[PDB]
Amino acid sequence: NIVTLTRFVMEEGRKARGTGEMTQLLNSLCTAVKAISTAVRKAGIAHLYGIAGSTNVTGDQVKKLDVLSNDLVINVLKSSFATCVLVSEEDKNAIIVEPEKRGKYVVCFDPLDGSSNIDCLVSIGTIFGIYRKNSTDEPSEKDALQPGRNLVAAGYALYGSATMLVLAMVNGVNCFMLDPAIGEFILVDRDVKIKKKGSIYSINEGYAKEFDPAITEYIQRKKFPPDNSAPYGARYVGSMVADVHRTLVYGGIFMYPANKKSPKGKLRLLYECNPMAYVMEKAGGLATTGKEAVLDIVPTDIHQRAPIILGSPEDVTELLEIYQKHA
Amino acid sequence: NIVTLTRFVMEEGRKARGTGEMTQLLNSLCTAVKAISTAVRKAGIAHLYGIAGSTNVTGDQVKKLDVLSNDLVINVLKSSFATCVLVSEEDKNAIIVEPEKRGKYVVCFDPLDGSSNIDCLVSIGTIFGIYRKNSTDEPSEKDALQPGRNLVAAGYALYGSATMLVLAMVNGVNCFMLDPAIGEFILVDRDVKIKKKGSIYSINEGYAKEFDPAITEYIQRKKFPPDNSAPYGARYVGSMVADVHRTLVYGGIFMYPANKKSPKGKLRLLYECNPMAYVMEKAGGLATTGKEAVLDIVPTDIHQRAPIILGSPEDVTELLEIYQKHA
Numbered sequence: 054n055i056v057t058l059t060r061f062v063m064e065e066g067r068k069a070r071g072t073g074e075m076t077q078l079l080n081s082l083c084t085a086v087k088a089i090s091t092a093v094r095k096a097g098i099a100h101l102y103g104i105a106g107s108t109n110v111t112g113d114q115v116k117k118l119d120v121l122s123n124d125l126v127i128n129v130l131k132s133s134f135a136t137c138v139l140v141s142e143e144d145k146n147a148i149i150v151e152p153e154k155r156g157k158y159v160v161c162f163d164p165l166d167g168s169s170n171i172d173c174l175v176s177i178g179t180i181f182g183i184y185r186k187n188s189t190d191e192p193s194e195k196d197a198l199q200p201g202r203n204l205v206a207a208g209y210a211l212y213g214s215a216t217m218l219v220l221a222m223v224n225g226v227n228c229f230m231l232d233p234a235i236g237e238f239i240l241v242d243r244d245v246k247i248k249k250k251g252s253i254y255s256i257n258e259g260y261a262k263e264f265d266p267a268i269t270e271y272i273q274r275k276k277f278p279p280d281n282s283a284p285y286g287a288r289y290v291g292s293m294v295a296d297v298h299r300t301l302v303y304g305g306i307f308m309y310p311a312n313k314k315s316p317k318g319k320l321r322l323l324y325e326c327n328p329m330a331y332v333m334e335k336a337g338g339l340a341t342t343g344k345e346a347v348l349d350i351v352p353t354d355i356h357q358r359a360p361i362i363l364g365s366p367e368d369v370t371e372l373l374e375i376y377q378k379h380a
Numbered sequence: 381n382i383v384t385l386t387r388f389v390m391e392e393g394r395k396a397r398g399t400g401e402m403t404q405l406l407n408s409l410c411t412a413v414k415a416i417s418t419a420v421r422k423a424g425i426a427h428l429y430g431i432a433g434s435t436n437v438t439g440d441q442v443k444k445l446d447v448l449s450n451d452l453v454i455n456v457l458k459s460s461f462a463t464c465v466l467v468s469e470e471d472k473n474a475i476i477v478e479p480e481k482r483g484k485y486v487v488c489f490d491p492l493d494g495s496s497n498i499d500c501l502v503s504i505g506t507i508f509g510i511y512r513k514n515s516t517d518e519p520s521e522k523d524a525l526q527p528g529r530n531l532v533a534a535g536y537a538l539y540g541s542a543t544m545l546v547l548a549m550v551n552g553v554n555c556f557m558l559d560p561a562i563g564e565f566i567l568v569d570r571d572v573k574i575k576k577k578g579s580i581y582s583i584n585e586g587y588a589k590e591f592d593p594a595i596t597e598y599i600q601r602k603k604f605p606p607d608n609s610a611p612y613g614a615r616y617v618g619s620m621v622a623d624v625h626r627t628l629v630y631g632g633i634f635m636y637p638a639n640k641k642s643p644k645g646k647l648r649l650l651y652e653c654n655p656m657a658y659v660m661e662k663a664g665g666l667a668t669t670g671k672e673a674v675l676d677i678v679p680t681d682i683h684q685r686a687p688i689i690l691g692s693p694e695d696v697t698e699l700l701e702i703y704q705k706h707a
């Protein structure tokens with residue numbers, strides 16, 4: 054009873070009595086992630102280095118991995134005929150879908166996240182969040198300004214040692230492994246739940262000078278626990294999709310809080326924070342700014358930033374108590 | 381012209397007037413690394429999950445990633461007819477090659493490192509160090525107990541967003557990107573040199589309570605710089621090969637010093653520290669225990685551990701001066 058993502062998605066659409074438009078959109082997304090994975094793994098790189106001659110144009114201008122991944126997502130998504138508005142980290146304004154290709158969905162995505170890790174080959178990934186068009190007027194940027202609570206689907210693809218697509222919908226989270234020998238995502242983990250308490254903390258301690266008193270206290274607690282329990286281990290890949298995936302599967306906490314220089318945090322609400330907050334809540338974990346659920350935030354700009362703390366419910370509640378403690 | 385790793389080692393063997401044994405050893409390593417990469421990226425995994433029913437298996441005989449990598453390196457190394465003693469992290473005793481397949485080389489390797497990161501799909505890698513047998517006695521474990529200074533070649537493969545093989549020899553360090561479309565490593569960065577000073581520090585701060593006063597002062601300095609420069613960013617993937625590769629390519633410093641449960645450090649001298657210390661010094665970087673050069677330690681146990689600090693010379697030197705001050 055092997056379950057490919059293609060068959061999973063078709064069946065959830067049948068169970069939900071969908072008309073086939075959201076199924077097609079998820080099929081197209083699966084296709085774009087496979088194409089991005091292949092480019093990320095550098096298939097055909099020998100051509101760029103002149104294996105078939107013409108090795109003089111080394112002068113970088115040939116589509117960077119980032120620009121290519123964005124082109125794939127946009128073109129594949131438009132070709133699904135299921136979207137009307139697209140929001141991408143790469144584009145200043147929302148992309149409005151042409152009338153002929155227009156569907157009812159709104160898609161926020163980060164085509165390739167973990168940009169500082171690209172050149173050192175560290176894990177990177179793709180993040181997406183899917184909304185249903187809310188108004189009845191002309192599609193525009195305002196259709197992407199819905200709180201995360203209105204998400205129909207969200208998840209990510211991780212381009213790590215292997216490629217995995219994690220997909221969250223109303224009934225739960227499932228993890229599919231890419232078999233690159235046949236171009237098929239295989240269900241390997243069903244209805245995933247995060248553990249109640251972890252033993253790993255994930256944050257860039259280089260900002261220690263700019264952290265707030267609550268974050269400062271919490272970290273001290275992880276290293277020197279007052280009850281003398283075992284100190285947490287530390288992990289910070291520096292790519293959000295990889296640190297968050299580890300969090301989902303191993304437990305613990307992930308933090309990118311505001312700080313003195315980034316008073317609103319660094320991560321983007323629409324296509325970084327909301328999708329992972331959605332994956333985390335559907336797995337039994339939490340996602341907070343420290344004062345409110347990420348998913349309940351009402352966006353006001355498509356490139357708006359928000360602080361985020363996510364992970365095991367007990368670890369996140371502990372930091373929240375510390376925020377309350379500090380008034 | 382385009383340069384494959386195959387062409388590179390062959391021409392390097394010709395220039396050195398070798399008999400071809402070391403060339404054959406290096407080509408075998410390159411074959412083992414391709415086969416491990418393909419397994420790591422999960423090609424064929426659908427078969428495990430029953431895409432073809434249950435019949436392609438007589439029993440429960442299946443192998444963990446780590447067991448499979450170990451078996452690929454041992455069997456492919458042996459078949460090169462170039463080795464006489466192998467040391468693997470996975471075997472308590474040195475492996476002595478049968479006389480019929482004996483060559484003059486001693487190889488120390490970690491077939492798959494970063495085991496804590498395997499189930500969460502973070503970057504993992506293969507590490508290797510190569511020595512010439514310096515004796516006329518029957519081959520034995522003692523032939524592996526040489527200081528890293530005696531290495532003839534070392535390096536690693538990183539299975540990250542893409543697969544890369546980094547090879548260091550007497551003349552310098554080179555990086556080859558694997559093109560999985562054609563099964564060819566392609567030379568992409570020549571005679572690599574680390575930056576003299578970096579801006580990233582890499583360590584598990586979870587062990588904060590067990591750190592010596594010099595590591596403690598250094599980390600504080602990275603977060604609250606006396607000259608008021610910008611603090612370093614922090615990165616810690618949790619896989620030595622990923623963190624060391626970022627160090628090489630971006631600069632800065634990587635640390636695993638002694639702690640509680642590792643009063644002599646955690647990382648293994650023969651097949652973790654020495655290969656990385658050799659790449660670093662050949663790249664113009666430094667590698668020290670805090671008190672002496674990693675490459676000059678004379679081992680007495682194939683599985684002995686050592687503390688290690690490595691990376692950009694101005695950064696490692698700064699920490700060495702802390703240690704000297706305290707003393």
Ligand SMILES: Nc1ncnc2c1ncn2[C@@H]1O[C@H](COP(=O)(O)O)[C@@H](O)[C@H]1O
Nearest residue numbers: 062065066069071072073074075076205
């Ligand atoms: N493949 C699917 N998987 C999960 N839910 C689906 C699927 N197809 C449709 N749905 C649900 O049914 C709604 C309407 O689908 P549609 O008619 O395709 O726009 C969607 O917004 C989802 O809530």
Ligand SMILES: Nc1ncnc2c1ncn2[C@@H]1O[C@H](COP(=O)(O)O)[C@@H](O)[C@H]1O
Nearest residue numbers: 389392393396398399400401402403532
């Ligand atoms: N492909 C090669 N690349 C670099 N050095 C090599 C190569 N082949 C041989 N050498 C050097 O020449 C020595 C003798 O080689 P061999 O006769 O093959 O054992 C080796 O120990 C190396 O120091």
Ligand SMILES: O=P(O)(O)OC[C@H]1O[C@](O)(CO)[C@@H](O)[C@@H]1O
Nearest residue numbers: 166167168169257291292293613
């Ligand atoms: O170096 P910093 O400030 O920790 O930023 C890293 C974060 O930025 C991102 O690259 C987003 O731009 C995330 O993937 C990652 O979590």
Ligand SMILES: O=P(O)(O)OC[C@H]1O[C@](O)(CO)[C@@H](O)[C@@H]1O
Nearest residue numbers: 493494495496584618619620621
């Ligand atoms: O969890 P810790 O103690 O930081 O150990 C991390 C180290 O463990 C290893 O997995 C052991 O080889 C290294 O790859 C890594 O640098």
Ligand SMILES: [Mg+2]
Nearest residue numbers: 142163166167
């Ligand atoms: Mg991003």
Ligand SMILES: [Mg+2]
Nearest residue numbers: 469490493494
């Ligand atoms: Mg190891």
Ligand SMILES: [Tl+]
Nearest residue numbers: 142319320321
């Ligand atoms: Tl961004």
Ligand SMILES: [Tl+]
Nearest residue numbers: 119142143168
């Ligand atoms: Tl970007």
Ligand SMILES: [Tl+]
Nearest residue numbers: 142163165166
């Ligand atoms: Tl991006």
Ligand SMILES: [Tl+]
Nearest residue numbers: 319320321325
């Ligand atoms: Tl960001």
Ligand SMILES: [Tl+]
Nearest residue numbers: 446469470495
């Ligand atoms: Tl092991």
Ligand SMILES: [Tl+]
Nearest residue numbers: 469490492493
């Ligand atoms: Tl290992």
Ligand SMILES: [Tl+]
Nearest residue numbers: 646647648652
């Ligand atoms: Tl180790």
Ligand SMILES: [Tl+]
Nearest residue numbers: 469646647648
């Ligand atoms: Tl080890």
